Symmetry: D2
Subunit: 115 residues, 4 copies
Amino acid sequence: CPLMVKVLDAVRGSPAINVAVHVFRKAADDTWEPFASGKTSESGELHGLTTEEEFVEGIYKVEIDTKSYWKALGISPFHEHAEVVFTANDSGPRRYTIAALLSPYSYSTTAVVTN
Amino acid sequence: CPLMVKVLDAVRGSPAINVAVHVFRKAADDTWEPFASGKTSESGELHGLTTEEEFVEGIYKVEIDTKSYWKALGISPFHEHAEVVFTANDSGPRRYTIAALLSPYSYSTTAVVTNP
Amino acid sequence: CPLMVKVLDAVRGSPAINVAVHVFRKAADDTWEPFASGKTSESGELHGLTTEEEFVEGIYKVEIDTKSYWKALGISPFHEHAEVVFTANDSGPRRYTIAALLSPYSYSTTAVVTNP
Amino acid sequence: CPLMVKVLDAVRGSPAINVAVHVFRKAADDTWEPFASGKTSESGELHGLTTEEEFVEGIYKVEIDTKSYWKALGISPFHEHAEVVFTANDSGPRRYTIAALLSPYSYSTTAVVTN
Ligand SMILES: COc1ccc2c(c1)c(CC(=O)O)c(C)n2C(=O)c1ccc(Cl)cc1
Ligand SMILES: COc1ccc2c(c1)c(CC(=O)O)c(C)n2C(=O)c1ccc(Cl)cc1
Protein backbone atom coordinates (compact mmCIF):
# COMPACT_ATOMS: atom_id res chain seq x y z
CA CYS A 1 0.00 0.00 0.00
CA PRO A 2 2.16 2.89 -1.36
CA LEU A 3 -0.39 5.59 -0.46
CA MET A 4 -2.50 5.77 2.69
CA VAL A 5 -4.74 8.63 3.85
CA LYS A 6 -5.45 9.13 7.51
CA VAL A 7 -7.99 11.70 8.62
CA LEU A 8 -8.62 12.80 12.17
CA ASP A 9 -11.19 15.01 13.83
CA ALA A 10 -9.71 17.65 16.16
CA VAL A 11 -13.16 18.63 17.44
CA ARG A 12 -14.29 15.23 18.66
CA GLY A 13 -10.81 13.70 19.05
CA SER A 14 -11.65 10.82 16.83
CA PRO A 15 -10.87 9.31 13.48
CA ALA A 16 -12.73 11.26 10.79
CA ILE A 17 -14.92 8.44 9.51
CA ASN A 18 -16.67 8.21 6.12
CA VAL A 19 -14.74 11.15 4.67
CA ALA A 20 -14.65 11.08 0.90
CA VAL A 21 -11.08 11.23 -0.39
CA HIS A 22 -10.18 11.68 -4.05
CA VAL A 23 -6.71 11.18 -5.41
CA PHE A 24 -5.72 12.79 -8.69
CA ARG A 25 -2.60 12.59 -10.79
CA LYS A 26 -1.50 15.63 -12.77
CA ALA A 27 -1.84 14.79 -16.47
CA ALA A 28 0.62 16.07 -19.12
CA ASP A 29 -1.90 18.77 -20.11
CA ASP A 30 -1.68 20.01 -16.48
CA THR A 31 -5.16 18.76 -15.53
CA TRP A 32 -6.09 16.63 -12.53
CA GLU A 33 -6.93 13.13 -13.56
CA PRO A 34 -9.02 11.07 -11.15
CA PHE A 35 -6.75 8.31 -9.98
CA ALA A 36 -8.28 6.80 -6.84
CA SER A 37 -10.93 7.55 -4.21
CA GLY A 38 -12.61 6.11 -1.14
CA LYS A 39 -14.19 6.87 2.20
CA THR A 40 -12.13 6.78 5.36
CA SER A 41 -12.78 3.76 7.56
CA GLU A 42 -13.86 3.69 11.22
CA SER A 43 -10.17 4.22 12.00
CA GLY A 44 -10.30 7.34 9.80
CA GLU A 45 -8.03 5.51 7.39
CA LEU A 46 -8.16 4.95 3.67
CA HIS A 47 -6.11 2.00 2.48
CA GLY A 48 -5.75 0.35 -0.91
CA LEU A 49 -6.10 3.55 -2.91
CA THR A 50 -3.42 2.41 -5.30
CA THR A 51 -0.74 -0.20 -5.89
CA GLU A 52 3.03 0.21 -6.30
CA GLU A 53 2.73 -0.46 -10.05
CA GLU A 54 0.06 2.24 -10.45
CA PHE A 55 1.69 4.76 -8.11
CA VAL A 56 4.36 6.08 -10.45
CA GLU A 57 6.31 9.31 -9.95
CA GLY A 58 4.19 12.35 -10.63
CA ILE A 59 2.28 15.16 -9.01
CA TYR A 60 -0.65 13.98 -6.94
CA LYS A 61 -3.57 15.77 -5.41
CA VAL A 62 -5.31 14.21 -2.44
CA GLU A 63 -8.63 15.95 -2.00
CA ILE A 64 -10.38 15.34 1.29
CA ASP A 65 -14.07 16.27 1.36
CA THR A 66 -13.79 17.94 4.73
CA LYS A 67 -16.86 20.10 4.12
CA SER A 68 -19.27 17.13 3.82
CA TYR A 69 -17.69 15.72 6.96
CA TRP A 70 -18.41 18.89 8.93
CA LYS A 71 -21.88 19.17 7.38
CA ALA A 72 -22.63 15.66 8.67
CA LEU A 73 -21.65 16.77 12.19
CA GLY A 74 -23.67 19.99 11.90
CA ILE A 75 -20.61 22.21 12.20
CA SER A 76 -20.07 25.10 9.79
CA PRO A 77 -16.78 24.49 7.97
CA PHE A 78 -14.51 27.07 6.41
CA HIS A 79 -12.86 24.99 3.71
CA GLU A 80 -14.48 23.42 0.70
CA HIS A 81 -11.99 20.60 1.26
CA ALA A 82 -8.42 19.77 2.22
CA GLU A 83 -6.28 19.57 -0.90
CA VAL A 84 -2.91 17.84 -0.47
CA VAL A 85 -0.72 18.27 -3.53
CA PHE A 86 2.69 16.65 -3.70
CA THR A 87 5.33 15.08 -5.91
CA ALA A 88 5.62 11.32 -5.52
CA ASN A 89 9.31 10.85 -6.12
CA ASP A 90 10.56 7.35 -6.53
CA SER A 91 14.12 7.45 -5.15
CA GLY A 92 14.46 4.42 -2.83
CA PRO A 93 11.34 2.47 -1.77
CA ARG A 94 8.59 4.75 -0.33
CA ARG A 95 5.23 4.64 1.42
CA TYR A 96 3.14 7.80 1.71
CA THR A 97 0.77 8.42 4.58
CA ILE A 98 -1.14 11.62 4.02
CA ALA A 99 -2.56 12.59 7.35
CA ALA A 100 -5.09 15.33 7.80
CA LEU A 101 -6.10 16.75 11.13
CA LEU A 102 -9.43 18.49 10.73
CA SER A 103 -11.02 21.42 12.47
CA PRO A 104 -13.94 23.43 11.11
CA TYR A 105 -11.80 26.48 10.39
CA SER A 106 -8.42 24.80 10.26
CA TYR A 107 -6.82 21.76 8.78
CA SER A 108 -3.33 20.51 9.08
CA THR A 109 -1.84 17.94 6.79
CA THR A 110 1.36 16.00 7.12
CA ALA A 111 3.20 13.49 5.02
CA VAL A 112 4.80 10.47 6.59
CA VAL A 113 7.14 9.07 3.98
CA THR A 114 8.81 5.83 5.00
CA ASN A 115 10.77 2.85 3.60
CA CYS B 1 -8.65 44.60 3.04
CA PRO B 2 -11.16 41.70 3.25
CA LEU B 3 -8.55 39.05 2.42
CA MET B 4 -5.18 38.69 4.09
CA VAL B 5 -2.75 35.81 3.93
CA LYS B 6 -0.29 35.17 6.77
CA VAL B 7 2.46 32.61 6.26
CA LEU B 8 4.65 31.30 9.03
CA ASP B 9 7.73 29.15 8.94
CA ALA B 10 7.51 26.45 11.64
CA VAL B 11 11.18 25.43 11.19
CA ARG B 12 12.67 28.88 11.69
CA GLY B 13 9.95 30.29 13.96
CA SER B 14 9.67 33.28 11.70
CA PRO B 15 7.35 34.78 9.15
CA ALA B 16 7.63 33.03 5.79
CA ILE B 17 8.88 35.94 3.68
CA ASN B 18 8.48 36.40 -0.10
CA VAL B 19 6.10 33.46 -0.39
CA ALA B 20 4.15 33.69 -3.63
CA VAL B 21 0.40 33.55 -3.04
CA HIS B 22 -2.10 33.07 -5.85
CA VAL B 23 -5.81 33.60 -5.36
CA PHE B 24 -8.29 32.10 -7.79
CA ARG B 25 -12.05 32.43 -7.90
CA LYS B 26 -14.31 29.71 -9.23
CA ALA B 27 -15.99 31.00 -12.39
CA ALA B 28 -19.55 30.16 -13.47
CA ASP B 29 -18.13 27.48 -15.80
CA ASP B 30 -16.44 25.85 -12.76
CA THR B 31 -12.92 26.87 -13.85
CA TRP B 32 -10.44 28.63 -11.58
CA GLU B 33 -10.14 32.21 -12.75
CA PRO B 34 -7.09 34.17 -11.50
CA PHE B 35 -8.38 36.55 -8.83
CA ALA B 36 -5.29 38.06 -7.21
CA SER B 37 -1.71 37.23 -6.28
CA GLY B 38 1.19 38.62 -4.30
CA LYS B 39 4.24 37.98 -2.14
CA THR B 40 4.22 37.81 1.65
CA SER B 41 6.09 40.68 3.20
CA GLU B 42 8.85 40.61 5.83
CA SER B 43 6.12 40.03 8.43
CA GLY B 44 4.98 37.00 6.41
CA GLU B 45 1.82 38.92 5.59
CA LEU B 46 0.14 39.61 2.30
CA HIS B 47 -2.20 42.58 2.36
CA GLY B 48 -4.06 44.37 -0.44
CA LEU B 49 -4.89 41.25 -2.45
CA THR B 50 -8.38 42.56 -3.05
CA THR B 51 -11.08 45.07 -2.10
CA GLU B 52 -14.58 44.93 -0.60
CA GLU B 53 -15.96 45.67 -4.08
CA GLU B 54 -13.89 43.05 -5.90
CA PHE B 55 -14.11 40.34 -3.24
CA VAL B 56 -17.63 39.19 -3.98
CA GLU B 57 -19.27 35.91 -3.02
CA GLY B 58 -17.70 32.85 -4.49
CA ILE B 59 -15.47 29.90 -3.96
CA TYR B 60 -11.93 31.09 -3.67
CA LYS B 61 -8.71 29.14 -3.80
CA VAL B 62 -5.62 30.55 -2.12
CA GLU B 63 -2.55 28.74 -3.41
CA ILE B 64 0.55 29.40 -1.33
CA ASP B 65 3.79 28.56 -3.09
CA THR B 66 5.38 26.73 -0.20
CA LYS B 67 7.51 24.56 -2.49
CA SER B 68 9.53 27.51 -3.89
CA TYR B 69 9.79 28.81 -0.36
CA TRP B 70 11.37 25.65 1.05
CA LYS B 71 13.55 25.17 -2.04
CA ALA B 72 14.99 28.68 -1.67
CA LEU B 73 15.86 27.65 1.92
CA GLY B 74 17.58 24.48 0.62
CA ILE B 75 14.82 22.11 1.65
CA SER B 76 13.03 19.72 -0.68
CA PRO B 77 9.51 19.94 0.69
CA PHE B 78 6.73 17.40 0.35
CA HIS B 79 3.88 19.64 -0.83
CA GLU B 80 3.65 21.56 -4.09
CA HIS B 81 1.78 24.25 -2.16
CA ALA B 82 -0.52 25.05 0.72
CA GLU B 83 -3.92 25.50 -0.85
CA VAL B 84 -7.00 26.87 0.92
CA VAL B 85 -10.33 26.56 -0.88
CA PHE B 86 -13.37 28.21 0.65
CA THR B 87 -16.71 29.84 0.05
CA ALA B 88 -16.33 33.52 0.79
CA ASN B 89 -19.03 36.05 1.73
CA ASP B 90 -22.00 33.64 1.66
CA SER B 91 -23.56 35.35 4.71
CA GLY B 92 -22.46 38.82 3.53
CA PRO B 93 -18.96 40.39 3.46
CA ARG B 94 -16.50 39.04 5.99
CA ARG B 95 -12.82 39.73 6.62
CA TYR B 96 -10.63 36.68 5.96
CA THR B 97 -7.24 36.03 7.41
CA ILE B 98 -5.89 32.86 5.90
CA ALA B 99 -2.95 31.73 7.99
CA ALA B 100 -0.61 28.99 6.87
CA LEU B 101 2.01 27.43 9.11
CA LEU B 102 4.71 25.71 7.10
CA SER B 103 6.96 22.77 7.70
CA PRO B 104 8.74 20.94 4.90
CA TYR B 105 6.40 17.93 5.21
CA SER B 106 3.38 19.50 6.85
CA TYR B 107 1.32 22.60 6.83
CA SER B 108 -1.67 23.81 8.66
CA THR B 109 -4.05 26.34 7.33
CA THR B 110 -6.43 28.30 9.49
CA ALA B 111 -8.96 31.00 8.79
CA VAL B 112 -9.82 33.89 11.02
CA VAL B 113 -13.13 35.19 9.76
CA THR B 114 -14.45 38.39 11.29
CA ASN B 115 -17.50 40.58 10.68
CA PRO B 116 -16.58 44.22 9.93
CA CYS C 1 6.63 43.99 24.32
CA PRO C 2 9.06 41.03 23.99
CA LEU C 3 6.38 38.42 24.71
CA MET C 4 3.00 38.21 23.03
CA VAL C 5 0.50 35.39 23.08
CA LYS C 6 -1.97 34.93 20.22
CA VAL C 7 -4.79 32.42 20.64
CA LEU C 8 -7.01 31.28 17.81
CA ASP C 9 -10.15 29.21 17.83
CA ALA C 10 -10.00 26.61 15.02
CA VAL C 11 -13.69 25.67 15.43
CA ARG C 12 -15.09 29.17 15.07
CA GLY C 13 -12.33 30.60 12.86
CA SER C 14 -11.98 33.49 15.23
CA PRO C 15 -9.62 34.83 17.84
CA ALA C 16 -9.95 32.96 21.12
CA ILE C 17 -11.12 35.82 23.34
CA ASN C 18 -10.71 36.12 27.14
CA VAL C 19 -8.41 33.11 27.32
CA ALA C 20 -6.46 33.16 30.56
CA VAL C 21 -2.71 32.94 29.96
CA HIS C 22 -0.23 32.29 32.75
CA VAL C 23 3.50 32.75 32.28
CA PHE C 24 5.93 31.08 34.65
CA ARG C 25 9.70 31.32 34.77
CA LYS C 26 11.89 28.49 35.99
CA ALA C 27 13.60 29.61 39.19
CA ALA C 28 17.14 28.64 40.24
CA ASP C 29 15.65 25.91 42.46
CA ASP C 30 13.92 24.44 39.37
CA THR C 31 10.43 25.51 40.50
CA TRP C 32 7.99 27.41 38.30
CA GLU C 33 7.78 30.96 39.61
CA PRO C 34 4.79 33.04 38.44
CA PHE C 35 6.14 35.49 35.86
CA ALA C 36 3.09 37.14 34.30
CA SER C 37 -0.51 36.44 33.34
CA GLY C 38 -3.37 37.98 31.42
CA LYS C 39 -6.43 37.50 29.24
CA THR C 40 -6.42 37.48 25.45
CA SER C 41 -8.21 40.46 24.01
CA GLU C 42 -10.97 40.57 21.37
CA SER C 43 -8.26 40.02 18.76
CA GLY C 44 -7.19 36.88 20.66
CA GLU C 45 -3.98 38.68 21.55
CA LEU C 46 -2.29 39.20 24.86
CA HIS C 47 0.13 42.11 24.92
CA GLY C 48 2.03 43.74 27.78
CA LEU C 49 2.78 40.52 29.67
CA THR C 50 6.30 41.72 30.31
CA THR C 51 9.07 44.19 29.47
CA GLU C 52 12.56 44.02 27.96
CA GLU C 53 13.96 44.59 31.47
CA GLU C 54 11.82 41.96 33.18
CA PHE C 55 11.98 39.35 30.42
CA VAL C 56 15.46 38.08 31.11
CA GLU C 57 17.01 34.80 30.03
CA GLY C 58 15.36 31.72 31.38
CA ILE C 59 13.05 28.85 30.73
CA TYR C 60 9.55 30.14 30.49
CA LYS C 61 6.28 28.28 30.54
CA VAL C 62 3.23 29.83 28.93
CA GLU C 63 0.11 28.06 30.14
CA ILE C 64 -2.96 28.87 28.10
CA ASP C 65 -6.23 28.05 29.82
CA THR C 66 -7.87 26.37 26.86
CA LYS C 67 -10.05 24.18 29.06
CA SER C 68 -11.99 27.12 30.58
CA TYR C 69 -12.21 28.56 27.10
CA TRP C 70 -13.88 25.50 25.58
CA LYS C 71 -16.07 24.95 28.65
CA ALA C 72 -17.42 28.51 28.41
CA LEU C 73 -18.32 27.65 24.79
CA GLY C 74 -20.12 24.48 25.96
CA ILE C 75 -17.42 22.08 24.84
CA SER C 76 -15.69 19.55 27.07
CA PRO C 77 -12.17 19.74 25.71
CA PHE C 78 -9.45 17.11 25.95
CA HIS C 79 -6.55 19.23 27.21
CA GLU C 80 -6.27 21.01 30.54
CA HIS C 81 -4.34 23.73 28.72
CA ALA C 82 -2.01 24.58 25.87
CA GLU C 83 1.40 24.88 27.46
CA VAL C 84 4.51 26.24 25.74
CA VAL C 85 7.84 25.77 27.52
CA PHE C 86 10.92 27.40 26.06
CA THR C 87 14.30 28.91 26.72
CA ALA C 88 14.02 32.63 26.13
CA ASN C 89 16.78 35.12 25.29
CA ASP C 90 19.69 32.63 25.26
CA SER C 91 21.29 34.42 22.28
CA GLY C 92 20.28 37.87 23.59
CA PRO C 93 16.82 39.52 23.73
CA ARG C 94 14.33 38.34 21.14
CA ARG C 95 10.67 39.15 20.54
CA TYR C 96 8.40 36.14 21.08
CA THR C 97 5.00 35.63 19.62
CA ILE C 98 3.56 32.44 21.00
CA ALA C 99 0.60 31.47 18.87
CA ALA C 100 -1.81 28.75 19.88
CA LEU C 101 -4.47 27.35 17.59
CA LEU C 102 -7.22 25.62 19.53
CA SER C 103 -9.55 22.77 18.81
CA PRO C 104 -11.37 20.88 21.54
CA TYR C 105 -9.11 17.82 21.11
CA SER C 106 -6.05 19.37 19.53
CA TYR C 107 -3.91 22.42 19.67
CA SER C 108 -0.89 23.62 17.89
CA THR C 109 1.56 26.04 19.32
CA THR C 110 3.99 28.01 17.23
CA ALA C 111 6.58 30.62 18.03
CA VAL C 112 7.52 33.57 15.92
CA VAL C 113 10.86 34.73 17.23
CA THR C 114 12.26 37.95 15.82
CA ASN C 115 15.38 40.04 16.51
CA PRO C 116 14.55 43.67 17.41
CA CYS D 1 -3.18 -0.46 25.62
CA PRO D 2 -5.26 2.43 27.09
CA LEU D 3 -2.64 5.09 26.30
CA MET D 4 -0.53 5.34 23.15
CA VAL D 5 1.78 8.18 22.11
CA LYS D 6 2.51 8.81 18.46
CA VAL D 7 5.11 11.36 17.45
CA LEU D 8 5.77 12.58 13.95
CA ASP D 9 8.40 14.78 12.38
CA ALA D 10 6.99 17.55 10.15
CA VAL D 11 10.47 18.49 8.91
CA ARG D 12 11.51 15.11 7.56
CA GLY D 13 7.99 13.69 7.11
CA SER D 14 8.75 10.70 9.22
CA PRO D 15 7.93 9.09 12.51
CA ALA D 16 9.84 10.87 15.27
CA ILE D 17 11.96 7.95 16.43
CA ASN D 18 13.70 7.55 19.81
CA VAL D 19 11.85 10.47 21.38
CA ALA D 20 11.75 10.26 25.15
CA VAL D 21 8.19 10.46 26.44
CA HIS D 22 7.30 10.78 30.11
CA VAL D 23 3.82 10.32 31.45
CA PHE D 24 2.86 11.83 34.80
CA ARG D 25 -0.26 11.63 36.89
CA LYS D 26 -1.28 14.62 38.98
CA ALA D 27 -0.96 13.62 42.65
CA ALA D 28 -3.40 14.86 45.35
CA ASP D 29 -0.80 17.46 46.45
CA ASP D 30 -0.99 18.84 42.86
CA THR D 31 2.46 17.54 41.86
CA TRP D 32 3.33 15.51 38.78
CA GLU D 33 4.08 11.95 39.68
CA PRO D 34 6.12 9.93 37.18
CA PHE D 35 3.78 7.28 35.91
CA ALA D 36 5.27 5.85 32.71
CA SER D 37 7.94 6.63 30.11
CA GLY D 38 9.59 5.27 26.99
CA LYS D 39 11.18 6.12 23.68
CA THR D 40 9.12 6.21 20.52
CA SER D 41 9.69 3.26 18.20
CA GLU D 42 10.78 3.30 14.54
CA SER D 43 7.10 3.96 13.78
CA GLY D 44 7.31 6.98 16.10
CA GLU D 45 5.00 5.13 18.45
CA LEU D 46 5.11 4.42 22.14
CA HIS D 47 2.98 1.48 23.21
CA GLY D 48 2.58 -0.29 26.53
CA LEU D 49 3.00 2.81 28.65
CA THR D 50 0.30 1.65 31.01
CA THR D 51 -2.45 -0.91 31.49
CA GLU D 52 -6.20 -0.42 31.92
CA GLU D 53 -5.92 -1.24 35.64
CA GLU D 54 -3.19 1.38 36.15
CA PHE D 55 -4.75 4.03 33.91
CA VAL D 56 -7.39 5.32 36.30
CA GLU D 57 -9.25 8.62 35.92
CA GLY D 58 -7.05 11.58 36.72
CA ILE D 59 -5.08 14.40 35.21
CA TYR D 60 -2.17 13.22 33.10
CA LYS D 61 0.80 14.99 31.63
CA VAL D 62 2.49 13.51 28.60
CA GLU D 63 5.86 15.17 28.23
CA ILE D 64 7.60 14.65 24.92
CA ASP D 65 11.30 15.48 24.88
CA THR D 66 11.07 17.29 21.58
CA LYS D 67 14.19 19.35 22.27
CA SER D 68 16.53 16.30 22.46
CA TYR D 69 14.92 15.05 19.26
CA TRP D 70 15.71 18.28 17.42
CA LYS D 71 19.19 18.41 18.97
CA ALA D 72 19.85 14.93 17.55
CA LEU D 73 18.90 16.20 14.08
CA GLY D 74 21.00 19.36 14.49
CA ILE D 75 18.01 21.67 14.28
CA SER D 76 17.53 24.48 16.80
CA PRO D 77 14.23 23.88 18.60
CA PHE D 78 12.03 26.46 20.26
CA HIS D 79 10.32 24.32 22.87
CA GLU D 80 11.90 22.59 25.82
CA HIS D 81 9.34 19.86 25.16
CA ALA D 82 5.75 19.16 24.16
CA GLU D 83 3.60 18.89 27.27
CA VAL D 84 0.19 17.26 26.78
CA VAL D 85 -1.99 17.64 29.85
CA PHE D 86 -5.44 16.10 29.96
CA THR D 87 -8.12 14.51 32.12
CA ALA D 88 -8.50 10.78 31.57
CA ASN D 89 -12.21 10.38 32.16
CA ASP D 90 -13.55 6.90 32.44
CA SER D 91 -17.11 7.15 31.06
CA GLY D 92 -17.52 4.22 28.62
CA PRO D 93 -14.45 2.23 27.49
CA ARG D 94 -11.65 4.49 26.13
CA ARG D 95 -8.28 4.36 24.39
CA TYR D 96 -6.12 7.48 24.22
CA THR D 97 -3.73 8.15 21.37
CA ILE D 98 -1.74 11.28 22.05
CA ALA D 99 -0.30 12.34 18.76
CA ALA D 100 2.31 15.02 18.42
CA LEU D 101 3.35 16.55 15.14
CA LEU D 102 6.73 18.19 15.61
CA SER D 103 8.39 21.14 13.98
CA PRO D 104 11.37 23.01 15.42
CA TYR D 105 9.31 26.10 16.26
CA SER D 106 5.89 24.49 16.33
CA TYR D 107 4.21 21.44 17.69
CA SER D 108 0.69 20.30 17.34
CA THR D 109 -0.87 17.68 19.53
CA THR D 110 -4.12 15.83 19.12
CA ALA D 111 -6.03 13.30 21.13
CA VAL D 112 -7.70 10.38 19.44
CA VAL D 113 -10.08 8.95 22.00
CA THR D 114 -11.84 5.79 20.85
CA ASN D 115 -13.87 2.81 22.13
C1 LIG E 1 -3.97 37.17 12.61
O1 LIG E 1 -4.05 35.74 12.51
C2 LIG E 1 -3.01 34.92 12.87
C3 LIG E 1 -3.09 33.55 12.64
C4 LIG E 1 -2.04 32.71 12.99
C5 LIG E 1 -0.88 33.22 13.57
C6 LIG E 1 -0.81 34.60 13.79
C7 LIG E 1 -1.86 35.45 13.44
C8 LIG E 1 0.51 34.91 14.41
C9 LIG E 1 1.12 36.23 14.86
C10 LIG E 1 0.33 37.49 14.57
O2 LIG E 1 0.12 37.82 13.39
O3 LIG E 1 -0.07 38.17 15.54
C11 LIG E 1 1.16 33.58 14.52
C12 LIG E 1 2.54 33.37 15.11
N1 LIG E 1 0.28 32.69 14.01
C13 LIG E 1 0.56 31.33 13.95
O4 LIG E 1 1.46 30.84 14.62
C14 LIG E 1 -0.21 30.35 13.10
C15 LIG E 1 -1.02 29.40 13.73
C16 LIG E 1 -1.74 28.48 12.97
C17 LIG E 1 -1.65 28.51 11.59
CL1 LIG E 1 -2.57 27.32 10.62
C18 LIG E 1 -0.84 29.46 10.95
C19 LIG E 1 -0.12 30.38 11.71
C1 LIG F 1 -4.41 7.99 15.62
O1 LIG F 1 -3.00 8.03 15.43
C2 LIG F 1 -2.42 8.90 14.54
C3 LIG F 1 -2.50 10.27 14.75
C4 LIG F 1 -1.92 11.16 13.85
C5 LIG F 1 -1.24 10.68 12.73
C6 LIG F 1 -1.15 9.31 12.54
C7 LIG F 1 -1.74 8.41 13.43
C8 LIG F 1 -0.38 9.04 11.31
C9 LIG F 1 -0.08 7.65 10.74
C10 LIG F 1 1.36 7.36 10.35
O2 LIG F 1 1.81 7.86 9.31
O3 LIG F 1 2.06 6.60 11.06
C11 LIG F 1 -0.04 10.42 10.81
C12 LIG F 1 0.74 10.75 9.57
N1 LIG F 1 -0.59 11.27 11.72
C13 LIG F 1 -0.50 12.66 11.64
O4 LIG F 1 -0.22 13.19 10.57
C14 LIG F 1 -0.70 13.60 12.80
C15 LIG F 1 -1.73 14.55 12.75
C16 LIG F 1 -1.92 15.43 13.81
C17 LIG F 1 -1.08 15.37 14.92
CL1 LIG F 1 -1.31 16.50 16.30
C18 LIG F 1 -0.05 14.44 14.98
C19 LIG F 1 0.14 13.56 13.92
